[PDB]
Amino acid sequence: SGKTQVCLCMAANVAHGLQQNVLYVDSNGGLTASRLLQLLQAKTQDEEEQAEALRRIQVVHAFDIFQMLDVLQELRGTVAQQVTGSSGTVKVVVVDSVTAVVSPLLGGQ
DNA sequence: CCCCCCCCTATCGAATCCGTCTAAAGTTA
Ligand SMILES: Nc1ncnc2c1ncn2[C@@H]1O[C@H](COP(=O)(O)OP(=O)(O)OP(=O)(O)O)[C@@H](O)[C@H]1O
Ligand SMILES: [Mg+2]
């Protein structure tokens, strides 16, 4: 319906319209960089601006609950350790799909 | 006590008439 498209457009806006770091957790494989490039072109036309906006987007793959927990705990630890600094922090993190990695566990007794 | 789905079938039933054309052959004082 709309979930991945809305997430991608919001991430593109936050990465370009505010100049902040954003992490994306893609689990179902629903993230193509061509869509992000199209959205950025729809926003602005400078190539270096698009490259800099893309450099603030980090994508990680986690196809089960354990990998997702590992990457989230790694982010927690690194941010809690890096509280002294004031640059490169992540303000928005998007999980592409939580049902993908949770549904296999459920079902039964 | 907990959380998610399935599938097509089978033929029926007849109606309605129209429009005319072509003449030929003399006979017996
Ligand atoms: N130019 C375009 N590029 C990409 N998607 C487009 C475009 N124009 C329209 N769309 C729509 O974007 C939708 C993408 O769906 P999306 O992946 O965001 O939904 P979803 O609910 O998160 O899906 P899923 O359950 O498969 O993860 C398509 O249904 C398509 O109709
Ligand atoms: Mg999707």
CA distance linking residue A86 with residue A89, whole number of Å:
7
Helix or strand (DSSP H, E) at A7: helix A3-17
Tokens of A46: 């400078």
User: Residues by CB within 7 Å of nucleic chain B, which ones?
Assistant: A 103, 106-109
Tokens of A34: 């061509």
CA distance linking residue A50 with residue A8, whole number of Å:
15
Q: Under DSSP, is residue A46 helix (H, G, I), strand (E, B) or coil? A: coil
Query: In the structure, how far is the CA atom of residue A65 from the C1' atom of nucleotide B7, in angstroms?
Result: 36
Residue A43 and residue A2 in contact, taking contact as beta carbons nearer than 8 Å: no
Which amino acid makes up residue A97?
S
Q: How was this structure determined?
A: cryo-EM
With a CB cutoff of 8 Å and minimum separation 6, the contacts of A93 are: A22, A23, A24, A25, A75
User: For residue A12, what are the CA distances in angstroms to A70, A92, A100, A104?
Assistant: 25, 11, 23, 31
Resolution in A: 2.6
